[PDB]
Design a protein around this ligand. Structure first.
Ligand SMILES: [Zn+2]
Length: 7
């Protein structure tokens, strides 16, 4: 799967 971090 794909991942995204939004800090
Ligand atoms: Zn993955």
């Amino acid at each position: 799967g794909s991942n995204q971090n939004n800090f």
